[PDB]
């Protein structure tokens, strides 16, 4: 019944956002709630932000 078939492959670049799921290797899960601007992030004495 099928005369001809066309397969298309799309590639999509997905960036992380709130709602995505992240974790370590110790069973520590979490969902991203908010993406904070770098200015607002806690930063050490040296200036390097977390």
């Amino acid at each position: 019944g099928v005369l001809k078939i066309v397969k298309v492959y799309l590639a999509v670049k997905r960036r992380i956002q709130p709602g995505d799921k992240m974790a370590g290797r110790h069973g520590n899960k979490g969902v991203i709630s908010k993406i904070n601007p770098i200015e607002d992030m806690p930063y050490d004495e040296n200036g390097t932000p977390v």
Binding site: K13, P37, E39, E45, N46, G47
Partner: protein, 230 residues
């Protein structure tokens, strides 16, 4: 009111990238007042240049691989995000790069426009393995600020481009890192004064001093609203 203005004292540019800026005298508590406010501005608002678009011939999309080239096209694009460019006159320039042969292609190999300085000429772009391989591209560098990803642009950009042309996430912001230390400045009478030492690490070009001027200007512009309108 015992108004007291600071004066820009030392600009120890340890490296073109890294620069310390001492600043004194500041009245008590203004070290941190100004220190933090500037730091916030410096990180975000700071305007700069970045590769917005790319076009390599014989390349339809970023996921393909070119023959005679070690790096896949995405890898090349990543390197272009990192490419440090200063455009003096215009806000938009399109640089060309035609290179061949068995060579690690660097930034120097790009044909520099009269008013376009390549800050890190040694910056790696692509590795040409086959000697008969010749790579030819045109990189559009625009001036902007902050971070404008390609996904932001495609969404608002109903303006269709030709296939072939590869849009890139624009990292316009030049300031890589910034921190401020506050030490006590000593006057004959006033030992409660403070000095502000701002340590900046930026990519190429954007001059420590010049960036300071601009950041202070942005803050003052905002203050217009709270002074002038009530």
């Amino acid at each position: 009111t015992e108004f007291l203005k600071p004066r820009l004292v030392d600009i120890e540019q340890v490296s073109s990238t890294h620069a310390k800026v001492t600043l004194e005298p500041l009245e008590r508590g203004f070290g941190h007042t100004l220190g933090n406010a500037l730091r916030r501005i410096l990180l975000s608002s700071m305007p700069g240049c970045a590769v917005t678009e790319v076009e390599i011939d014989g390349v339809l999309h970023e996921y393909s691989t070119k023959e005679g080239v070690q790096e896949d096209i995405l890898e090349i694009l990543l390197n272009l995000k990192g490419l440090a460019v200063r455009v003096q006159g215009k806000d938009e320039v399109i640089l060309t790069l035609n290179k061949s042969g068995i060579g690690p292609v660097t930034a120097a190999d790009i044909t520099h426009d009269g008013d376009v300085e390549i800050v890190k000429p040694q910056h790696v772009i692509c590795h040409l393995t086959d000697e008969n391989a010749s790579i030819s591209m045109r990189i559009k560098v625009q001036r902007g600020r902050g971070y404008v990803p390609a996904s932001t642009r495609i969404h608002s950009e109903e303006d269709e481009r030709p296939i072939g042309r590869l849009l890139v996430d624009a990292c316009y912001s030049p300031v890589e890192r910034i921190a401020y230390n506050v030490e006590a400045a000593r006057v004959e009478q006033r030992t409660d004064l403070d000095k502000l030492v701002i340590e900046m690490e930026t990519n190429g070009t954007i001059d420590p001093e010049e960036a300071i001027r601009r950041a202070a200007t942005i803050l003052a512009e905002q203050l217009e609203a709270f002074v002038d309108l009530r």
